[PDB]
């Protein structure tokens, strides 16, 4: 969208981490299943290369662009100000957290 | 419980953050974590709020 | 009358505690109205880089919290030793040396605390990898056969950090009129061979230079692949893939920060799949064996110190100056101090150089004893040689 | 003692480096070794003429080594502050009418010719010894090389094809050539090897149709040393992975960027070295133009 | 250039960045290159620093491809000096009658650099009238119709009958 980019931004981290997966062993078995084209998500797939991790990497960059974020946001106060600080630092221990 | 760098909890100015965080966090129910993942993948017959 | 000996003796006191060892920095340039400090951060292609001067709030006992009020006890009831009006009493001078080995030692405390942490992690740089796609091309070359693919946004979390820690201008853009003399020029200026997309179609020039050099395109996004690389002679289409990580190691040959010692080139081919779990309990256990209990009084500071361990990634980690609000500058070779461009690992200048040796030891055949398969069949044990 | 009819043109005076397998001479080595031309220029000055009070001899009795020195400290590898209790100056001895103390074979000073001990023919070090008794004095703050100007030279010397040196202009060229697991340190030590003196002595004290002819002969061995050098201070020295190999590259050869701290894939330069390479230099050189 | 007995404290008065910092860097860059015509009005001081600095990112901006470079060089090494064959020759007069002057060591003659734009420029007050010309020698192609935003009176107001 033209303008507004930065909220684009802000709103592609969404975009799951996984690959879709179609039920073959199930599709093989028979077993019921709606759709006819049974192939499903699964939410993160596996680690191929030996020490990266594509999936918790990935949250580390949106411990970014939002840590990032923390700080285009401004404000008018003292607990707001302090507090805006140390949670920029909450945020991304709690990253290393998930790593 | 292990929430936040511990001694965030402590310092004077955080504690407004150290509450948000405190607040909106939960307590590990050893019944909802099994639940939140079985949802994943199962079917779905109410159209989740 | 206190302002007399207090700035002629007090002073000459800082005169030269404005020089001890360990008390390094620049504490106030002298002009209120205009000196905010050097940000000194520790830079971390890996993890969130953590800054030096933060607002931690870890209150060292007590201590960070300025108390004003603590004139008035000095000026009106506090005794002088020069002022001492009248008495001789002569001066004292500390023997520096007290206070110098002390110095020399928690130093010392510190360099050795940080050693195993600092060599693994060292061991392991040349190892993220990113995940590359393979496009076939002239049918007939196995896997590696033509023009290498990486997600843009993927690129950037890997593969970028590090040029812009290595300086040296940002890639070229390879982009439908440019051919191997423009490529060539910037792959050769950049040294990592890597090129970034925009517009498609990219001219046959340009497609057999990136086969027959193995450029790694960094591609946004993946619709039709296929379509944007004027495609002739076929043989190249969205279904040839070789999904390949690529060993950050095998595309960054710059020894000052990435051990990529041949020998070490198989070190970790050796290894079984990492975590930042393991690495780190390596570093826990590496570390717990080497039993090193140092001073009566080097003791102290970690007791003192709270080592309680040492979060931060560290999987490179870069001294570099952080101008006000994120960014994270470069190394302008002309304002920051040259100790600090690379980093080694962390490593005394020394030391490195034994482990110059050992890696070759590690890989010397007569110590290898620990082969692979063996073989199931059924002869005679009749003049057994053991070969 | 021993005469020379030329001296580096004599058997165990052979110049080697050893590349990959065997060990080849440098004239071979250096065709191994390419350029990359940079958007940029590099005009050569005047090295100035060497200052004349060679220094003071100094009481010292032991004959202190002097190729190891020099060379250690040039090519070093880790020699920290060269210019302290730094003899190169006692080198200054040899240099006279009739001294006795005889420069040996083995790079050391003797004072008096010893049992069974080669030695260059007193006849030439007293001009050899008779000019680089200078290199002595690069710490004394008036006499100091030039430094980061001396740099053009050693350049184009080492590259800029025949035509570069010519007319004196001649882009910053960066050096690429085929490394091999820590190539640059190792064709380095391996210098540090040469008996450099065997070199020198002859450098500066041969006529005329024999010097010229050997100053051609020996450019190729010559370069290969001020290349084992350039390095030392360059820019940002680089591996580059290609198809198989590893073409390693000197980011600007030719243009001292003041560089000094450990960097691994060479020889660093504390700033003492740093002057003192800037001293060796500028004699060496000023005399290598007959 | 004009020829004039100019006694002055030393002949090139520019000032070597010693570990300047681009800003710095580009600003001496153009420095050398002399890029003006001889203005004969006053320039106002204070803005005079933004006024030259950025007149550089202008200048190699429009640049020239061939003086584009010559110019991208000065801008790296800059701890040199760049006079001008003229100048040269000049401080040479001066070194010759007393070898004790010692002016700066690393420097580098130019070649009478490479054509140019004499910029016109100065900081006055005036606003400038042009009178367009009616036909050049930049045979246009076409290029994009132009859009001017919105004069926002306080600035300029129009009015009904001069």
Redesign the interface.
Known sequence: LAGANTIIAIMRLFTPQGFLRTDDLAIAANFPRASRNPQ?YI?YTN????????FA??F??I??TL??VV?ERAVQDD?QK??R???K??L??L??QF? | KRYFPENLEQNQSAARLVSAVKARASEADISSIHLAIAREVSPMFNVHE | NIAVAHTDHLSVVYATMSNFMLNFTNNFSGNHATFKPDQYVITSPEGSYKPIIERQGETVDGLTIIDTSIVWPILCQCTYPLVRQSIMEEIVYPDPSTTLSQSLSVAQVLSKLTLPDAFINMILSGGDSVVMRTYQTEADDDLDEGIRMTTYDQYLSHIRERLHITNVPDPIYITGASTPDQIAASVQATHVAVVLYQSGVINGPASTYLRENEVLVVMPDYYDVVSRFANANLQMNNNRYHESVLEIADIFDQADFIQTSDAVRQLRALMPTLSTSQIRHAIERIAQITDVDSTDYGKLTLRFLGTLTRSLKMQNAQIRRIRPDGTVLRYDDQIDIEAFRWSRYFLDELQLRRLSVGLRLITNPRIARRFNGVRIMYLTDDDPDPD | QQPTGGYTTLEQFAFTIRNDGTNATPTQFLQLLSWEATENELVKKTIPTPETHLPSARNVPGNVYIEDAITQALFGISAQNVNAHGYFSRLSALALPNTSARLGLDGVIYNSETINIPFYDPAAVANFAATYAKLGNASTPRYRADMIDIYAHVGLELAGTDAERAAGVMPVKRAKFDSWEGSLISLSRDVVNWKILAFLIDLCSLEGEALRAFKTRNRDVFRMMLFIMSTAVAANVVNRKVTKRVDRVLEYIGVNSMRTAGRTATITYDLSRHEFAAKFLQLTFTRWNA | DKGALVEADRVIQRLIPLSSSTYVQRLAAIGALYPNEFTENVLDLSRLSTALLQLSDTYYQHANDQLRRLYRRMYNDSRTLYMTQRHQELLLAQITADPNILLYPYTYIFTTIPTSMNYISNTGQGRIKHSLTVTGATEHDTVADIVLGQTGEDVITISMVE
Do not use: F, K, L
């Not at chain 1, 680690?47 to 594509?54: A, D, L, P, S, Y």
């Open positions: 499903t939410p680690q191929r290369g030996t020490v990266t991790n594509e990497s990935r580390r960059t411990v970014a840590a990032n700080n607990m302090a507090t600080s140390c949670t630092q909450w991304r221990h990253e290393t790593d």
